[model samples]
Target: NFEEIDYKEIEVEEVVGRGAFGVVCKAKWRAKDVAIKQIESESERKAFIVELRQLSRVNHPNIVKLYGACLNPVCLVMEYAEGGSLYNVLHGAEPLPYYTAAHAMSWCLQCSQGVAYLHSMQPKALIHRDLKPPNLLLVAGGTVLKICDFGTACDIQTHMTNNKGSAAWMAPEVFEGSNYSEKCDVFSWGIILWEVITRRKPFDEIGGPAFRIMWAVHNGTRPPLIKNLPKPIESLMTRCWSKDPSQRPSMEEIVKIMTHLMRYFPGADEPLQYPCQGRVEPYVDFAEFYRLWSVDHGE
Candidate 1:
């Protein structure tokens, strides 16, 4: 059951995030720092309820925690992530050392563990329809990553049209109007992995209308892997973005491989170094990245 929170009890501190679905504000609740997401309309409110239900069912170290909700004004109270999003870290003024194999692999492993938990749920597997940098939150001074934004998530058994998710990160089958499965999330994860490793937007070199990007993905196009990528990781990325959903590795497999790779570095647990600690230009903003790669809708 969801906990009902009084809106008045929350003291708004500052706006933290905004999206097509709602606005997220940092707030003080029960003398603790929290995030309050306020939906804008009845339709979004209904979606918020769905997100709340889904989130309520999940409890994992790598997933955001939902504290409570306000029914009257349609808001959600969640654990505040002080480090902001992986998007901001990867593309903002302070970026992570993505070129470092251990740094990139560690974050990717954490994300895989999070997704693996969702897929392992009993009764039904939760498929995160949207998996991108923006939805991956960093906290504890960038030492931890958690999956957030359940608005587009659904049970894997739920049959759905391929219309949800950001266009660029969507699986090729999704763009082709085919029914997709949990592997769609794996496909998106592959794109994120590429971005984290290369510090570049997937398929940016193509440079074109969103439809062109969609078409390219549909026709077996993929981001180029970085040179000297470990053979195992390279193979994992290739299999993940395979055109055939059945060919993609499960999230569990991803976690296992990443874990195996991490064993090579004894000091892998150390906090990663940010690019700003040295000198590097920030990449494009997440909103701009979306604008550049995503179409309004896919066929």
Candidate 2:
């Protein structure tokens, strides 16, 4: 059983983001900044419970920190990652460079480590069914990243579910209805890695909705390997997208590859040049923000 939390006592602030289930609001409770995830249905509530239980059992610095949960309104109080998500930051006012890409890759490795840890859990192996840029949150400091949004995640050790994953990021095996496994998460990581380096949507250039994925499947062609992208890192990305899910490297191997790439091709500290006017707010104090959020929630 999970802890019984009082969500109604939490006060919600600005509408920060939205999704299929509900909206996320910037909220304060006990003077701490938090993300108030409010869902409407009982099913959504069940999902949150599962997420909390899974998260509580694991301890990884790169994973999103769950402060607590509120059951009444089906609200989850999660750690507020300042600067929003890596996706928004990469395309927003200021985009990062190859160096930033290297840094982000290291983060991707950390995320993989977190996921692998969950997969190693006994009784049932876990797989984050949805792994994408939007779900990778960048904490105030650029060096840190946390994987969020586990509604689509499940234990691979149990029964496999129907085809379910973001279209562009889904592994080929997933589409074929093969037994899904942790490798599928690795495939999604590959697509997201390309997104970070290029700072562009995976299939934005492909015309029509189906063209992008269909082209990838038939031709097995992928976006041009990013230029000057570290050779070893490039190879890892390719491995991640291996047509045969079994061919993909395990998260442990990925960690070793990423560590080497980080050392060989450490990213630059300079701000990235943008095609348009760039605007970014730096120096966000997440700890302080959370304190304010907690107080506002009357905790």
Candidate 3:
């Protein structure tokens, strides 16, 4: 039921992507460019409404903003990141920069802050059910990071045990079918942090779904921080993957740690031009499974 946006008023260019239930068109709005999501189903419409409501309650530069939405058919208009997804940047043709490590970590720290803010909301708690690198967008400068995609997000108070996320990023508890909380998101954050530091997928050397989780549960060790990586970064990477989720530092604590790291690694503003030579595949893009969401309502 979706139709082409008013390209005249659109001002910006063409479609950059078609996500799980919507089309992502890059356009210029109010003198700045943005990505607008146009959905074709009632459920996708509801999810966007929920995402917009949650975003309205938060105010963080790293979190994507909702400029407006279309209700006639249903669509979400959000801030656009010129640099595209972190997944693409890291997997792109360039080499990963030492500076980009710090830069990416800074944005991830901000992501934690936004998620933490949502978790701390009164009356109801929010959980970003899905957290992965693709959901993170980079700005042209490469230092700025913005977290996007909340369609799978839910309130902790009402969230269930079976809702699954990207397998590579899901926590062990999540795989065990345990009821999740904000801690689950923290666990997912750890996985994403690992990707940022190593520029490799967690357990990239491992194979098979059963073996992947088994390895993480038994032999799953986070990749060692690259020696070229700054010492403070090494320290935070340690905390991010602590075996005990409780041992994992809170986003507030992460902010403190990141700020401390910045003092010594001021060159973090440099670009992340890394070409990942690793063999692990990126998570299933929503477009690949777009049709399925309608059939299952994503369970």
Candidate 4:
């Protein structure tokens, strides 16, 4: 059974963030820091219920743990991530400037395993309709990450209705108002991989009507590839965002492929070498690429 939280003793702290949906606040509950979200609308209670149910069914390190829900007015208390959403670190007004290549590999690996867990759930699978960065929270100073916001998610079916998520992260089938399945989430992950490595917003260059950008994606307009990106990573990104949903690999396959890609990413402080064969500078600035270790190969 889902836990019912007694928010009476919960101390509301600072406002974490405000989304189109509602206000998320940091709170001290049961002596542990937690994240609480509430819309304060009777009509929106069911939305919170859906999210609660979705979250309660899953227990995984990569997915945020739901402490409980306040059933009355509908506030959700969840695990607090210190580093905030991956979105904030990547593209907030002032993005996190300390991103490293291993950060890129490790995070994408974290996400792949999380989504893979969801897709592999017992009985009907849970399709994380909203798999974008904002929904993926960073934990323990970005060493770990977790997926949140199941209001837009549902148990997998033959086909689902509606264009239910943000345009940039929404798969082509989703925004096209076509019948979408689990593959939709895979499409979002592909875009996220591109976003993760590049640290740029998808369709941010457009800086215009989002609907048109969705159309561009629907017509196969992916963001331009970075010049020095490894071919393996590039292939996986393209494979994930395939026009045909069937062409996209299952989440299990994605994890394996991603894990394989990680083999090429040297530690964050090591002497720099081309991620692929040959010599190629991976960044515009000398300090941008962090390597792991010293004495092995003097810098």
Which of the numbered candidates is closest to the native, going by highest lDDT?
A: 1
* Cα-based TM-score, every candidate: 0.74, 0.70, 0.64, 0.75
Q: For residues 223-266, what per-residue lDDT tens digits would candidate 3 score against the true structure?
A: 54554443355566666666666776766676666665444334
Write model 1 residue lDDT over 1-299, tens digit each, in one string. 44789998999875545322336677899988887767555644765576565556888999888788898788878877656677766766654543244556677889999999988887667777678887788776566788866544222222132223355687877666534468988999998987887677667667555656777888888877566555566789889989989999999989998887666433435665545442223232233223322343232
Segments in model 3 whose C-alpha atoms lie over 4 Å from true places: 1-52, 68-76, 94-101, 151-165, 209-235, 270-299
Model 3, position 145, has a per-residue lDDT of 74
Model 2 spans > 4 angstroms off: 17-23, 38-51, 72-75, 94-101, 153-165, 173-180, 209-221, 227-230, 267-299
Ranking by lDDT: 1, 4, 2, 3
Off by over 4 Å in 1: 6-23, 38-54, 70-75, 94-99, 151-165, 176-180, 206-212, 273-299
lDDT, candidate 4, 1-299, per-residue tens? 45888769689766645332345777888888877877444434644566566567888888877788887657777777655678876777642446667777778888889888888887767777668888887766567778865434222221132223367877878665534467988898888888877777788766555566777888988877766665667788888889999998888998998787555554534322233212223332223232322233357
Q: What range of 10 consecutive residues in model 4 has the weakest lDDT sum?
A: 153-162
lDDT of 3: 0.58
- TM-score: the better of candidates 1 and 3: 1
Error of 1 at 218 (Å): 2.6
In terms of lDDT, the poorest run of 10 residues in model 3 is 278-287
Compose the digit string of candidate 2's lDDT tens values, residues 98-193. 334445555677777777776777666667766777677766455667876553422332112322325567666655543357898888888877
Q: Select the stronger candidate by TM-score from 1 and 2.
A: 1
Candidate 4, pairs of clashing residues: 268-290, 268-291, 268-292, 269-291, 269-292, 270-291, 270-292
